[PDB]
Each structure stands twice: as structure tokens, then as C-alpha cells.
Design a protein around this ligand. Sequence first.
Ligand SMILES: NC(=O)c1ccc[n+]([C@@H]2O[C@H](COP(=O)([O-])OP(=O)(O)OC[C@H]3O[C@@H](n4cnc5c(N)ncnc54)[C@H](OP(=O)(O)O)[C@@H]3O)[C@@H](O)[C@H]2O)c1
Ligand SMILES: NC(=O)c1ccc[n+]([C@@H]2O[C@H](COP(=O)([O-])OP(=O)(O)OC[C@H]3O[C@@H](n4cnc5c(N)ncnc54)[C@H](OP(=O)(O)O)[C@@H]3O)[C@@H](O)[C@H]2O)c1
Ligand SMILES: CCCCC[C@@H](O)/C=C/C=O
Ligand SMILES: CCCCC[C@@H](O)/C=C/C=O
Lengths: 336, 345
Amino acid sequence: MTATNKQVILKDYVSGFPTESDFDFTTTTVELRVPEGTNSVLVKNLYLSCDPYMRIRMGKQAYTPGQPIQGYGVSRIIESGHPDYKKGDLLWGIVAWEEYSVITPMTHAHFKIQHTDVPLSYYTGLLGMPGMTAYAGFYEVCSPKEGETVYVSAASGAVGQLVGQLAKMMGCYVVGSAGSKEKVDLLKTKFGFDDAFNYKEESDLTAALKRCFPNGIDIYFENVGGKMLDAVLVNMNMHGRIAVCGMISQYNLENQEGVHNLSNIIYKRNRIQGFVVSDFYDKYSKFLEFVLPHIREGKITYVEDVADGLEKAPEALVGLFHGKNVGKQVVVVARE
Amino acid sequence: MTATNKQVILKDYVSGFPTESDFDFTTTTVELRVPEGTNSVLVKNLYLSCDPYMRIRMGKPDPSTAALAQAYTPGQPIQGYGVSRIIESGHPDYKKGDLLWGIVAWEEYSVITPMTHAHFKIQHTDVPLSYYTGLLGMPGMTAYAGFYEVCSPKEGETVYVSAASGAVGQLVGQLAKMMGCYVVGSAGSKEKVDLLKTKFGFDDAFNYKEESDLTAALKRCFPNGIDIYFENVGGKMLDAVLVNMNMHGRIAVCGMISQYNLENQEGVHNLSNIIYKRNRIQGFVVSDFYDKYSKFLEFVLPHIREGKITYVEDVADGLEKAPEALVGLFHGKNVGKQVVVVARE
Ligand SMILES: NC(=O)c1ccc[n+]([C@@H]2O[C@H](COP(=O)([O-])OP(=O)(O)OC[C@H]3O[C@@H](n4cnc5c(N)ncnc54)[C@H](OP(=O)(O)O)[C@@H]3O)[C@@H](O)[C@H]2O)c1
Ligand SMILES: NC(=O)c1ccc[n+]([C@@H]2O[C@H](COP(=O)([O-])OP(=O)(O)OC[C@H]3O[C@@H](n4cnc5c(N)ncnc54)[C@H](OP(=O)(O)O)[C@@H]3O)[C@@H](O)[C@H]2O)c1
Ligand SMILES: CCCCC[C@@H](O)/C=C/C=O
Ligand SMILES: CCCCC[C@@H](O)/C=C/C=O
């Protein structure tokens, strides 16, 4: 075939919060050939991830103006110049926001799917690059014992909803926070945490956390920052671990919020350790063969926001920095 | 037999900086009796220390601070670390001539109870007794504990040490030079920086005071960035270090002395940097590691006696000066460790 390839470019660099008018749709024409240099695969992009690191990549290796925005996503091989991928099987990894991409598959960037007995939308999230951040970030970096109390921020979403599920499986008391009432209702209905609150309904964030924890916070999984780290630093305990995954409060800000209560690290004998998921990708098969017995069984679940089409995909990345995503924000580019 | 026992009392709680005025003086009568309490010894305090925790045992009851603190009671005297000779006992491990270092009150004579990770015996006299406040005591143990067990160091790695000519800081940077390491310091005066470059053998050093852009100072000093940080300061300083740090690089949070004296506690912005740099900010109290005080003393006393560790001290005479001495530590007119002699020998 010689099909028309619909692409989402970034026009120019973003300074603050993203708008849909920082990105434009352009078209190329892909010849469905055995591809551009005999080391490569040609894929058809099935599902795409709208995940929040993309804002830090939108700043002045960083993205280049007039070219597609790179992201993770699930893809079907249409043709190959690589040895261990034939035509008709599945990968996940860094693809361009296209309908059809030619990529070179390097090991801990791009991964083959062997288990299609679960949704292939989950391989942008749960069994993808959000879910590995929750395995890796809770079991190494947070270093947990049972009974110990876990706090998850942006609990609602991607990374956050597996951290909490893995904790009320270990024997921990887990509290989450989220933006709207419907996002906060899932934490107790579906994912079945012990408590939850709406941080947007809290005028009282330090007092909110003193309410939820009569016994304090041993573990924190930091996805948010600033004002929430200040509050958590007060409500902590003796040898209290903080796992700094993200800072979504800060990405979208030029002159970014200051943390005041870092003196409660000497006193309260705290470890704040920052990680990157990429480092733990050697433990992906170890993760898959732990969590697929549990997803297949209904111990571990997932909520996804579905955004059908490449058309509503500027719409969908913009939407994270406000939290329109009721769970993990997937784009469907192709259904079959 | 009676003693005329002078004391240093605290008036009421501190907000902001201490002054010589937030402290007061009394005299008591102490009987030199063979004391019935339980496992209690009547000591005679010889030397005392001016240590900066004493500020967040001087402020109002807060739950955070109350992990190392108990908070000082507004009437009855200031507690702290210092050396002490036993002038009659009610213990097994201690008798009528033995010396102790530990947490005594700021008086001439005290009835204390020895506890294992509080009060420690001296069964080594070859070295100064004033040193069991600092080097052979609690500042030197912090330096051993927090550099070898929290900064998790390997040879050749680049170390930045803050409040570097004070008690804990000067030892860190020698313990670091005693491995492969590249040690740069920071201190207040010119007299202080000329002890880092010469006496305590640091590779380079500066005056944070005489530096306008602090990142520019640390990008001059380390071209290839910081691997280990011994954090004795906070604020401005911790922000500069986070942009000057290497990947999988560690930070040991000993103290944060810039903050203690502030009501409105200063913000560290770029703690964002620890994701993309895989960095570890780790806090400790020394209290947790006093089980390795035997394994400390078996190490350092071979290195002082051979001339591989160097140390300065700032002695002031009598309890009279012990207000003036704890105050001027927050400004920094202590050169090394601030000792207060109550009685010598
Ligand atoms: N270090 C790593 O290894 C690694 C890897 C991948 C991703 N990440 C990062 O970690 C986070 C992970 O995904 P996720 O689980 O958070 O999924 P998500 O729910 O899809 O992400 C968006 C969430 O951020 C919250 N939010 C947005 N603006 C905010 C603001 N201004 N202040 C406070 N909260 C705000 C919203 O939740 P509420 O209002 O609902 O609470 C919203 O649901 C991101 O920051 C991401 O960049 C880190
Ligand atoms: N268990 C523990 O973790 C533990 C135990 C002992 C001590 N500590 C802590 O570690 C720190 C110092 O240890 P040390 O034994 O070396 O004490 P020290 O001998 O009292 O050192 C005093 C230093 O304070 C500095 N200073 C004062 N105000 C300052 C300010 N506003 N900004 C920056 N620096 C300032 C001075 O330097 P300048 O001349 O440069 O101004 C001076 O050299 C304290 O924060 C203390 O509480 C912690
Ligand atoms: C090339 C895409 C970058 C992938 C690393 C990402 O997981 C890091 C998230 C940090 O916030
Ligand atoms: C009971 C006295 C407290 C002793 C702990 C002290 O070394 C901590 C210093 C923190 O800045």
C-alpha cells in the first residue's frame, strides 16, 4: 500500500501551560515497504500515550519545531529490516505521533508483546511505561514493610493507581488524593484504598493529611510537589521514605514553587530519592510475570480515558495539566 | 559536704535569633552525697558544648522538632553535651574518679542517670578532655556516621562540605581526603577559609558571604560537578548544589543552620532536579549510630596520634561566657568547635 500518513507536529516551543494551538496536523505519504535502512521496522500506530514528561520535552533531548512529537505507544508491525520482529506482531515504545512510523528497535526503549489476552491499551499504561514506574518506584525506592502507611498524590492516574493497588495487596494503609469528586470516588469504589480526599476541596492540606493519618506517613509516592511536599514533610514519621517520581505542579511553571519544610528531614530521619523508570527496565519480565496473574484474575484493575482519534490528541495532552483524564490518557489511532 | 552551684537558665522560648538576654543566671546548693535515686552519679561538669540543635530545643513546642528535642523547660537549666568527672557514684560501671561525656545540664555539678546511647565513658587519657565534646565525641561521630554510612562514598568522588570549618565539617573533609576524594569547603570569614586551604587540607574553598551568585562559585570549583554533599546549611546553598550535582549523586542532611533562626522558613526551589539526576537527599541524627561509637574510637585515635586528622577548637572560660558562646555560633565567631571550660583538668 501507499497510504496517506496523518501526523501531529509541534509548531513551536511552549512557555507555560499547553494549548491545542501549539500543535498542528500535517500529512505525509507512506509507502508500505521493507524500510529506510535494513536495521528498522515499519509500524501502524494503534494506541498512543498522553503522558506528562512531554511538557518537559516541549521546552527550549527536546523536540524540534515542524516535526512530529514523540511519545510512547502500542504498535503493529507491517514490515521488517530488524531480525527479531516479523510482520504481524506487537510492540510498545517510542513512536512518532503518526498513523505510520519507521523506527529502529533498541532493547530498553522498545519492547515486544507476547500476551494479547489483556487489552492492548493497557500496554501504554499498566503493562507499559506507567506501570513499570509503579513496580519500580514502590518496591525498590519506597522500601516497604506491611502495616506502614502510603500516600499517593495523582492517585487517580496512570502511575498512581497501581502504587495503591500494590500497597493494599502487601498489607499497607493507602490514601490517595485527586482533583474532582468522580476521580476521588474511584479510589474507594474500584481500587479500594482506605481513605481518599479531594485536594481541591482542601483549604487545609496539612490538616487534611493530619485527618487521614492519626498515625502519620511512612511512605510517599510523589507525583505532584510544591505545596503537597510541604504538607507531607510535616505529616511524616521517623524513617519516612519519599519516592520522587514527578513534580506535575512544576512542569507548566516558569518560576516554580519553593519548598519550605525540608528541615523535617534531619528531625524525622527522611530519605527523598528521585528515580527514572528506564533504569529498572531489566525488571520488566519480572514485573509482567508478577502482575499478569493478577490482571487476568481481577486483583489488579485499571481506569483509562479513551480519546478516540489522532484528531483529539492535542486536546488530550493539554487536558493532563488540568486533569481531564479520568485515569490514564490513551488515544486510539487504529482499532484493528 | 556542700557546693555553691552556678547555673545557666533559659528565661522563656526563642523566636528568631538568641541573645545573651534569653538566658539568665542562678546559684544552687548541691550536697556531694553518694546519691540514692537509681543508677545515678553526681558529677562535676568540666567542659560543655555549644552545639546548634540547642536552638530547636530553645524554640516553642512543635511535633517535628520533638524527634531529637524534648524542648527546654522555661525555668530549670539548659541541657547539653559535655565532659564530666564523677564526684561520688551509685552505679556499677562508674566509680569516684572516672570521667564521662554526655547530656548534662549547664551547671557546675549534676545528678544524672547514665544511659547507653547518651552517656559514655572515657577510658582513654592521652588526648584532651575538651575533645569529648567535639572530635572524640558527638561532632566527630556525626562526621564518621554521616560521611561513611549516609554519603555512601567511593574513592576519587567530588565532595562539597558546607559549614566546613565547624566541628563536624572540618572532620568530613579530612575523612574524605583520606579516601581518593576532591574536597571543597565553604565558610564565613577569610581566617576560616585559610584554615580549609592549609590546616584541614581541602583542595579549594570560598567565602559564601563574598559570593553573589553561588552557582557560579560551585561551577568554578567543580567543573565536572558534585557527587557527595554534606549538608550543614540549607536554602540558597541546597538550590545551587542541585543544579551543580551529578547523576546518582548523594546528599547527607546533617543540619540546615540557616533555617533554625528563621520564623519564616526559606524555600528551596529546584528539588525537581532529583528525578533527572537520580539523587538521594538523606537525613540522619547521630543518635541512631552510637552502637558504632566503639568502632569510631578504634579508628580516629590511631589517626590523631599519627597526624592524619587535624582539629581546631574555640575555648571560652567559665559558664559566664556560655550565653555569648552559644549565641555567636549563629553568626559564626566560633573558629572550630565551641567549648566552654567550666573547670579545667
Ligand atoms: N520519574 C519517572 O520514572 C516517571 C515516569 C513516567 C511519568 N512520570 C511523572 O509522574 C506523573 C505520573 O502520572 P500520573 O499517575 O500522575 O497520571 P495522570 O493522572 O494522567 O496525570 C495528571 C494528573 O496531575 C494532577 N495535576 C495537574 N496539574 C496539577 C497541578 N497544577 N497541581 C497539582 N496536581 C495537578 C491531576 O490530578 P488531581 O487534581 O486529580 O489530583 C491529574 O489527574 C507525572 O508528573 C509524570 O511526568 C515520572
Ligand atoms: N545529629 C545530627 O544530625 C547533628 C549533630 C551535631 C550537629 N548537627 C548540625 O550540623 C550543623 C553544624 O555542625 P558543627 O558541629 O560543625 O557546628 P559549629 O562548630 O557550631 O559550626 C558553626 C558554623 O555555623 C555557621 N553559620 C552560622 N550561621 C550561618 C548562616 N546563617 N548561614 C550559613 N552558615 C552559618 C558558621 O559559618 P560562617 O562563618 O560561614 O558564617 C560556623 O562555621 C548544625 O546545623 C547542627 O545542628 C547535626
Ligand atoms: C524519551 C522519553 C523519556 C522517557 C523517560 C520518562 O519516563 C521520564 C519521566 C520524567 O518525568
Ligand atoms: C537530646 C539532645 C539531642 C541530640 C541530637 C543532636 O545531635 C541532633 C542535632 C540536630 O540538629
